Design an enzyme around this catalytic site. Structure first.
Site, mmCIF file in Angstrom:
data_model
loop_
_atom_site.group_PDB
_atom_site.id
_atom_site.type_symbol
_atom_site.label_atom_id
_atom_site.label_comp_id
_atom_site.label_asym_id
_atom_site.label_seq_id
_atom_site.Cartn_x
_atom_site.Cartn_y
_atom_site.Cartn_z
ATOM 1 N N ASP A 8 -60.178 61.589 -49.839
ATOM 2 C CA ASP A 8 -59.477 60.302 -49.880
ATOM 3 C C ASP A 8 -59.602 59.755 -48.443
ATOM 4 O O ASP A 8 -59.942 60.508 -47.525
ATOM 5 C CB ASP A 8 -58.027 60.507 -50.318
ATOM 6 C CG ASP A 8 -57.216 59.209 -50.426
ATOM 7 O OD1 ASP A 8 -57.773 58.095 -50.577
ATOM 8 O OD2 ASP A 8 -55.971 59.347 -50.348
ATOM 9 N N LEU A 9 -59.380 58.450 -48.261
ATOM 10 C CA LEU A 9 -59.401 57.827 -46.934
ATOM 11 C C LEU A 9 -57.979 57.762 -46.359
ATOM 12 O O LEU A 9 -57.640 58.526 -45.456
ATOM 13 C CB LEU A 9 -60.047 56.441 -47.009
ATOM 14 C CG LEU A 9 -60.239 55.646 -45.711
ATOM 15 C CD1 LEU A 9 -61.198 56.284 -44.730
ATOM 16 C CD2 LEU A 9 -60.794 54.284 -46.048
ATOM 17 N N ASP A 10 -57.147 56.888 -46.915
ATOM 18 C CA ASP A 10 -55.803 56.695 -46.389
ATOM 19 C C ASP A 10 -54.949 57.954 -46.649
ATOM 20 O O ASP A 10 -54.884 58.461 -47.779
ATOM 21 C CB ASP A 10 -55.130 55.445 -46.966
ATOM 22 C CG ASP A 10 -53.702 55.265 -46.430
ATOM 23 O OD1 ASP A 10 -53.533 55.012 -45.225
ATOM 24 O OD2 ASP A 10 -52.738 55.438 -47.197
ATOM 25 N N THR A 16 -54.457 53.661 -42.804
ATOM 26 C CA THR A 16 -54.734 52.239 -43.023
ATOM 27 C C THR A 16 -53.387 51.521 -43.094
ATOM 28 O O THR A 16 -53.258 50.369 -42.666
ATOM 29 C CB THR A 16 -55.606 52.014 -44.322
ATOM 30 O OG1 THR A 16 -54.893 52.341 -45.508
ATOM 31 C CG2 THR A 16 -56.817 52.901 -44.343
ATOM 32 N N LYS A 45 -45.565 51.111 -49.917
ATOM 33 C CA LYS A 45 -46.437 52.268 -50.027
ATOM 34 C C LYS A 45 -46.801 52.479 -51.491
ATOM 35 O O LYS A 45 -45.919 52.651 -52.335
ATOM 36 C CB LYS A 45 -45.731 53.517 -49.491
ATOM 37 C CG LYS A 45 -45.317 53.478 -48.016
ATOM 38 C CD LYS A 45 -46.282 54.227 -47.109
ATOM 39 C CE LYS A 45 -47.549 53.427 -46.824
ATOM 40 N NZ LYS A 45 -48.801 54.233 -46.915
ATOM 41 N N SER A 114 -62.437 57.094 -52.342
ATOM 42 C CA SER A 114 -61.359 56.187 -51.982
ATOM 43 C C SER A 114 -61.387 54.903 -52.792
ATOM 44 O O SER A 114 -62.449 54.328 -53.082
ATOM 45 C CB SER A 114 -61.455 55.799 -50.501
ATOM 46 O OG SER A 114 -60.380 54.921 -50.133
ATOM 47 N N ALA A 115 -60.200 54.425 -53.081
ATOM 48 C CA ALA A 115 -59.997 53.119 -53.688
ATOM 49 C C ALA A 115 -60.185 51.984 -52.661
ATOM 50 O O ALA A 115 -60.202 50.806 -53.048
ATOM 51 C CB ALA A 115 -58.585 53.056 -54.292
ATOM 52 N N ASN A 118 -62.625 48.592 -48.204
ATOM 53 C CA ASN A 118 -63.237 48.565 -46.879
ATOM 54 C C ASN A 118 -63.685 49.921 -46.425
ATOM 55 O O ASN A 118 -63.918 50.142 -45.252
ATOM 56 C CB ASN A 118 -62.246 47.953 -45.922
ATOM 57 C CG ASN A 118 -61.868 46.562 -46.339
ATOM 58 O OD1 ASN A 118 -62.686 45.636 -46.263
ATOM 59 N ND2 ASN A 118 -60.656 46.397 -46.792
ATOM 60 N N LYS A 145 -54.578 54.373 -60.106
ATOM 61 C CA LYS A 145 -53.883 55.660 -59.816
ATOM 62 C C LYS A 145 -54.058 56.771 -60.854
ATOM 63 O O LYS A 145 -54.024 56.532 -62.050
ATOM 64 C CB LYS A 145 -52.379 55.432 -59.580
ATOM 65 C CG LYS A 145 -52.044 54.595 -58.347
ATOM 66 C CD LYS A 145 -50.642 53.991 -58.408
ATOM 67 C CE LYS A 145 -49.610 54.894 -57.754
ATOM 68 N NZ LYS A 145 -49.781 54.946 -56.269
ATOM 69 N N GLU A 169 -56.227 65.062 -50.742
ATOM 70 C CA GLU A 169 -55.414 63.901 -51.051
ATOM 71 C C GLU A 169 -53.997 64.069 -50.435
ATOM 72 O O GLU A 169 -53.538 65.191 -50.216
ATOM 73 C CB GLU A 169 -55.316 63.723 -52.574
ATOM 74 C CG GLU A 169 -56.211 62.659 -53.179
ATOM 75 C CD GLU A 169 -55.728 61.234 -52.945
ATOM 76 O OE1 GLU A 169 -54.583 61.002 -52.462
ATOM 77 O OE2 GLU A 169 -56.506 60.326 -53.279
ATOM 78 N N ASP A 170 -53.319 62.950 -50.202
ATOM 79 C CA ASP A 170 -51.930 62.952 -49.710
ATOM 80 C C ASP A 170 -50.925 62.413 -50.720
ATOM 81 O O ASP A 170 -49.777 62.206 -50.368
ATOM 82 C CB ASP A 170 -51.827 62.109 -48.433
ATOM 83 C CG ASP A 170 -52.028 60.633 -48.700
ATOM 84 O OD1 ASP A 170 -52.914 60.274 -49.505
ATOM 85 O OD2 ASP A 170 -51.322 59.811 -48.088
HETATM 86 MG MG LIG Z 1 -54.301 58.602 -49.682
#
Ligand SMILES: [Mg+2]
Length: 221
Positions: A8-10, A16, A45, A114-115, A118, A145, A169-170
């Site tokens: 995942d990114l964020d 982000t 969030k 990632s969703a 960017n 999700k 993932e977080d």
């Molecule tokens: Mg995340």
């Protein structure tokens, strides 16, 4: 041993979420609504852009036309794209660079799941593009999700089955997406937020190649 890691990114690679907070605050000021602060941003969030915007209008009990709503939404995004020009390699979370290096040196595939619209830009800004073997495109596959689709696409894009992969993932819906993909989840955060059943680390500094290995070996046993 696992053949790929799907990131995942964020919340994993970087944050982000702070730049979003600044985008929303700039819009709020720009239209004259008080009360968009870090405390209020926490309620954004995991919330859609349209929902987030509505919550900001609710701060002034404000009604706007559908065309105005759409223009405000767009401007927040413009603000965001502007904010993120300052993303740099200093935004990369601790442990993540060393992990990417170690995965790559051991010929383990690295994919972004990632969703984020960017994603490729943000990886460029953080100087991580060279480590990534693929970026799954969320415009093509539902990363809405808990959908495993983004994780399945990321694995496939580097030539592996999800079953040969670890996902990082977080978020609880992220962890669910990984499980339904057939990949093995390792969460980052608090027990209370993620799940009983899965392996969890308190921060990204604990995401080491040695640790991922030990977890893969304890799944197999
Ligand atoms: Mg995340």
């Amino acid at each position: 041993m696992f053949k790929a890691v799907l990131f995942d990114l964020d919340g994993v690679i970087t944050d982000t979420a702070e730049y979003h907070f600044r985008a929303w605050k700039a819009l709020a000021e720009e239209i004259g609504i008080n009360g968009v602060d870090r405390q209020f941003n926490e309620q954004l969030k995991g919330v859609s852009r349209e929902d987030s915007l509505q919550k900001i209008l609710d701060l002034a009990d404000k009604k706007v036309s559908a065309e105005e709503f759409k223009e405000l939404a767009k401007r927040k995004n413009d603000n965001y794209v502007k904010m993120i020009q300052d993303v740099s390699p200093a935004d990369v979370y601790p442990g993540i660079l060393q992990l990417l290096k170690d995965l790559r040196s051991n010929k383990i595939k690295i994919a972004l799941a990632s969703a984020s619209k960017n994603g490729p830009f943000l990886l460029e800004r953080m100087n991580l593009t060279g480590y990534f073997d693929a970026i799954a495109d969320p415009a093509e596959v539902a990363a809405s999700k808990a959908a495993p689709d983004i994780f399945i696409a990321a694995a496939h894009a580097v030539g592996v089955a999800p079953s040969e992969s670890i996902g990082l993932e977080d978020s609880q819906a992220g962890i669910q997406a990984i499980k339904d993909s057939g990949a093995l989840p390792i969460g980052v955060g608090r027990p209370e937020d993620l799940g009983d059943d899965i392996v969890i680390v308190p921060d990204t500094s604990h995401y080491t190649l040695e640790f991922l290995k030990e977890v893969w070996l304890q799944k197999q046993k």
